[PDB]
């Protein structure tokens, strides 16, 4: 089993077609689109459809990791490297050596991080902080972001060489507001989680479905999942309509 | 078996955070497994005082590098390897996030925790508390029927949602004089959250106000062992199953969290 | 002319720091002293909750700077001047000592009509706690009759004496069911300090535990004005009478403190 | 001044004690063990009775019940046994409640001391006189003593008392630097000016510049108001800089600029203002090694070393301790605290202490024992374990 | 001292009352009655073993004249203290003088012990010191008074308890004034007999009138060009007081039997312990003499007001022992606090006498609290 999402609209059809376009090769995969559009499941299903199937999948949400700590968890460090290191642990490449690396939120990469990732991509090797050992590992890297890159390089704070190295295989993500027609079916996907995680149940009425479809949905799929689980948890086993939707979700 | 780590929070002081953490850990220990309690109040260690144990070497030694982590695992009641921290040390309170992360990574050495590790977070919404709750898989909120406790719990929820987007929370009621009191408190807190933000919170249980807890604390021993046949002890025992066995089909994801080495594979 | 400031502390949460501070504020107000009440718990707000205040602008708007300190003052019940602290604001949860100063000196501008100031210092031994304790000359430790509270107060005294060398502390017992066990608590603290430290703990009285204070808490009002004919109310009136007997500060200290220009002149 | 109660059933003892009380200059109210209520009814209230001198107890319930009734009449009332001291049969609280025990035939000095203590705690326990004036535990007349170690300090005092340049003070922690600064300020021209003490070690280095000079909003992070710094508060006065070696490197050049040109600035703005602040510094380490290490700049050291002042540890002036032990105790009874009396063994052991902390910890110990076991008979045993030397 | 007080009083109640009164002070007393006073008085070692004789209410037949004659036969130099009654006006003039004080019924402590000190002076006379050192506030105020007074040259008034160290202040003023080369002369009027104060101050005249038995010139030519320090000016009788005012205001005197007037230029420094304006109200003190003398007031503090100085005094006292090789005692901290806590009525004289007695009792010993006399003994 795995985390599953389904759809029928034209945007998600293009999504699967474009995924299958690049699924036949192994290189850096750069994903562009707004945040909360479902990039993690894209990376995991690309891996599940890639050569690596017994290898583990390592996700790294750079928005949930401090900027100074990103290289510490990614590359790894020995026991004695700085004032905060008290134990030698391997970097996240070693834990998933022979798997699939996912690196979300590439927007806030510092220049040392950018050059280090470029070195990792080019020479296929790295080195732990406070050490000189050169270790090489093999992995398939999928980087993701929430800001459009072109402007981000135009600001001059993104290295163009790393931009071109990652953008060899660009990925376009379609926000849900252009594919609202399958949302109901997508809703029937999320209730599967309630039937797969055993945390309650929730239903959606037709009026509720159309009211939800009108909503702008900035952080489309993550906000959809958060809203459905929150509605289920606040009062399970109840009927969901238009009025009891928290706010702005009753756009009718 | 990927290790699930529970952290006890609530912001409001004196709710019972250290006490509920110690008693719940003893409850899981008596109900199987082998818990390894940790107190996140790195400058105010009250787990040892409540348990009556004398820590020869504390977590301040491994913070300063004097000894390894396995050195400070101190056996206590119920077969629990308490990891006491320093008491009365400000230098051990406010650490840089790098040191906190180094501590989280140093926990990876121990591999004798049967999916159990209780964290006793300090009072407040400071950097240490948030850094530890991001590292935990279950965050347990202990709150009492008092509007200041509601305000502090809601403030912690708001901070976590706004900065880090935490979504799932566990609500536990303490110092509730009636079974209806805890549910009313949970209803008020979720009403505030529903009015303002979008966070789902889960019910856990209730700890009634019993003088047995006071008498046991006076005896320098935890209430679970001093008065095992008591309403508070029975409440902790009931909370044991709810804490231990709910996430049976656990799917280990990956971010800055405890035992990430075991979660990856 | 000088302003007496009483920092209500104790490290251990739930001892009643916020409630005792509010009650002392309204008690000195009723005696005939114009009273200011500042919630040093800038991360989480409890003072405005107990007094029912719902300010439209708080200390955050002072700190990131869209107003002055005149606009945030609240005329609460009992003729008190409340300086609310933000609840759940990023700018407030963690502050450098530099910004804590930037608040502290700026707080001395609003000193035209002050007699007594009450500082509700946050729980724990964090940097803000220590800074606000050292910023106040009248430090009162609320101690409950539990060994956890005893050792946590001891840890706070050890932190403030080993590092900064302050020895004066005013011990106020709380949740005491008899007048004798408050003296017993003070004797226990004295024994612990004698065995370890060298400090001068001064007993200031016991606040009896009764449901009046709690039911005042749920009604969102101070027990001094909500229930002025209760055993706790009369005992706290006597405590306030003793508080007025405390001598006024005469000279400023080397470190940062509230109202330096008031004291020096 | 008020009256005294003599609840003694012995006719001879009560008679002679009443005669003695009339001698010493106060009236008396002779009573028995049971009919004291009707005699006390003649007083307006408990304030008119200073203290009671218990003698023989013959009523029902015993001396314990008699003292319970008396404390019910007045809980804040001292107890003065005469003839028979408290044995090991009464409860601990009743044992401690007694101010002192007399020994018939009545002794002069002990009786006046007991009455003076009684009136001290009577004045302390009532609600009159409102608040007082609190002061720091080290803020007493600590320049007392007969040793070479304090005569040298006073000599350098007098040497620098007639100048206005920067002064430098050296000595261990808690040795009495604040008193030195206050005495220098009071005996200088700017006596009426402000005395602002600041210790650079107590406050961190990042905000030390803000505390000293002052800042304004819009050109300072964390700034709220255009505060006038402690240098402005020191205009026409003195700035006592304790623990001076903890200032960062730029702080040294800033202090050099303000000391040489007598003008300073406020951080964030390009404005200058001139003051006449007197800089009296005090440090507890060796600057002759910190300069070589690379922390203390040469010019600032040579500008502050115009008039050095060296203290000495308490252990090097042991024969002064008793003097201080008196001068503290008097202070306490003249502050909002009762009076404490020591035995010969207690002080003899106290003079055997190496004093790892200087006078400051002596004052801390004195206050802690005053508020721990007050109005007692504290001897060598009642002293803490560390101070107990035999 | 070790001497005892005889209590010759017929009133049994007054006898026992005064007995317990004096037993409070720690001095040894013995209760006696006129019917049995003979053998008990004869039971003492000598007539000097008794400091004085205390007489209360007397109801025996024949009056107190016979008792006074019997006491005079017992000992010529024997002070008498009346208790409970004033000085009778029917007693002979030669007998009323031995009555030291007209004390009413047992008085306050200060009056009684001042009378006892006067009796001590009576005993000794019929049978200095480097003070002004320390940093106490009281001595600082006194030093400020010396700085304010020294630059001038006029009368100086000193007020303070008996035996508090006024002589050292007079010496300091004398050596800080323009009369350093001039003699400095102290005269204690209290310690001089009343009938001989005139001879001591004004001088002696050979054969001018009755009573001229001494051949020695007065302090007039001793004080010329210097300082005359007159201690205890309260005991100055009114005729001799107006004579002193004549000597002061006119700055000149005249020898009886001639017409030539002799000028003197002496700086007068009066010092007294009894309140002078209350004595003005009582009318037994001149108005203008006080006004002229009290132009430069020096409020000398008691030893209790400068307790911090006390130890520094002992050292100086101990120093006075080392220079003369007259013993060397070392006080421990216990004795230091025990003496410091004392009230010290005879502020400096009592301390010096105590040091002397301890030196004699324990030569080259560590004076603790046990070796201290009972009156100075202080414990926990
Ligand atoms: N040995 C000793 N005795 C002490 C000490 N503190 C107070 N006393 C005694 O207590 C008396 C009353 O002090 P107060 O109530 O502050 O009343 C004081 C206070 O208002 C003021 N004062 C005196 N000295 C100082 C001083 O150094 N600083 C300040 N700020 N005020 C002072 O003058 C009043 C009268 O002062 P005094 O005539 O000295 O009378 C003083 C003095 O006899 C101490 O540390 N040691
Ligand atoms: N409340 C109170 N506090 C007292 C008293 N005596 C001393 N202190 C405290 O002890 C500090 C040092 O007193 P000092 O050594 O006599 O050092 C004193 C002394 O040399 C001088 N001084 C102050 N007042 C007087 C006074 O009335 N007479 C004289 N002669 N000197 C004084 O000023 C110095 C510094 O005085 P402060 O800055 O006030 O600092 C004073 C004050 O904090 C007192 O009677 N009452
Ligand atoms: N059910 C209950 N009945 C009575 N008292 C209780 C209680 N639960 C907790 N307490 C009291 O709460 C205080 C603190 O409890 P404890 O130290 O176990 O944890 P805590 O987490 O509430 C403290 P903090 O908030 O400071 O971390 C003690 O006085 C304890 O006796
Ligand atoms: N004097 C007293 N008597 C009885 N109960 C008291 C009390 N003081 C406090 N309490 C109880 O404790 C609760 C919390 O009090 P308070 O808010 O003052 O705690 P506190 O401020 O010390 C913890 P924190 O610092 O984390 O806010 C009260 O609502 C009441 O239930």
Author numbering:
A (entry chain C): 142 to 393
B (entry chain A), C (entry chain B): 8 to 272
D (entry chain D): 4 to 393
E (entry chain E): 3 to 129, 142 to 394
Q: Could you share sentences copied from the article?
A:
FleQ and FleN act as master regulators of both flagellar motility and biofilm formation, while using different transcription activation mechanisms dependent on the target promoter and the presence or absence of the second messenger cyclic diguanylate (c-di-GMP). FleQ belongs to the NtrC subfamily of bacterial enhancer binding proteins (bEBP) and has conserved FleQ/FlrA/FlaK/FlgR homologs in Vibrio cholerae, Vibrio parahaemolyticus, Vibrio alginolyticus, Shewanella putrefaciens, and Helicobacter pylori, among others. The protein comprises an N-terminal receiver-like FleQ domain (FleQREC) and a C-terminal helix-turn-helix DNA-binding motif (FleQHTH). In between is a central bilobal AAA+ ATPase domain (FleQAAA+) composed of an N-proximal α/β subdomain (SD1) and a C-proximal α-helical SD2 module.
